[model samples]
Target: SGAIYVGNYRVVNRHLATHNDWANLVWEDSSRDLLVSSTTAQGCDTIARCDCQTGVYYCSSRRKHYPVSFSKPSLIFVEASEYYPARYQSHLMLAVGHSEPGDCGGILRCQHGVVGIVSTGGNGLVGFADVRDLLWLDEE
Candidate 1:
């Protein structure tokens, strides 16, 4: 909600998945901003909204009141917005026990994307389970 006009495909329709947990992908005007809300005691958001044009964001559930500023142009915002919501949906589904058990960790198929678990020979896709326990090889 700034000088940048939101594209039809970039509008985010998803909000908190479970309690304070939220996922958003705002992709428009070639800018990508990913927002994830957490429900930890640390606090994130119960509900929130931002007006980029006014340089402000507010979350009633978090009792958050703040200002924001946008700088240099960046990322493909539409793609990011769509991707994150899909990811959140997948995680919520699985967390609520909507997935089936398999020899390996099962799969989650979101309307716009997918997530799952795999082993050594598994395709190099993103993992939604036990990912925090893994490592990555940084390549320069």
Candidate 2:
């Protein structure tokens, strides 16, 4: 349940664009996306499957060397805290709330309600990303 490997690329000061994230997004070659286990975030069961025989993942679409794993990542709708469970994240939006360090990947539930996954924070402000539509590479 961690980061995944895709390709080799150098790192530089990139823009957050109202976003700041971590975990390989582990841009490591040898590191397999093993951080994330089974995900229901997308309201679907995706097995992060992997095959050690070939250092690539099997894809019904297209892929390269790595492990075989299910594809899942989504958002927690702005519903009662009871709706979205832990480890789940919020949709693309800045949650009007407070947070602190080590809160990354944390879920900030609202009183009598809650929303958004704990992202970067300061004072009573926090930012989050929509787990929904992940991997939705589209061109419209």
Best by TM-score: 2
lDDT of 2 at 71: 17
Per-candidate TM equals 0.19, 0.29
lDDT of 2 at 51: 16
Q: After superposing candidate 1, which stretches have Cα over 4 Å from the reference?
A: 1-11, 14-54, 76-140
In candidate 2, how many Å is residue 60 off?
38
- Candidate 2: minimum summed lDDT over ten consecutive residues — where? 26-35
**Candidate 1 clashing pairs?**
25-81, 26-77, 26-81, 27-77, 27-78, 28-78, 30-75, 31-77, 32-77
Worst 10 residues of 1 by lDDT: 131-140
Candidate closest to the true structure, highest lDDT: 2
User: How does model 1 fare in lDDT?
Assistant: 0.21
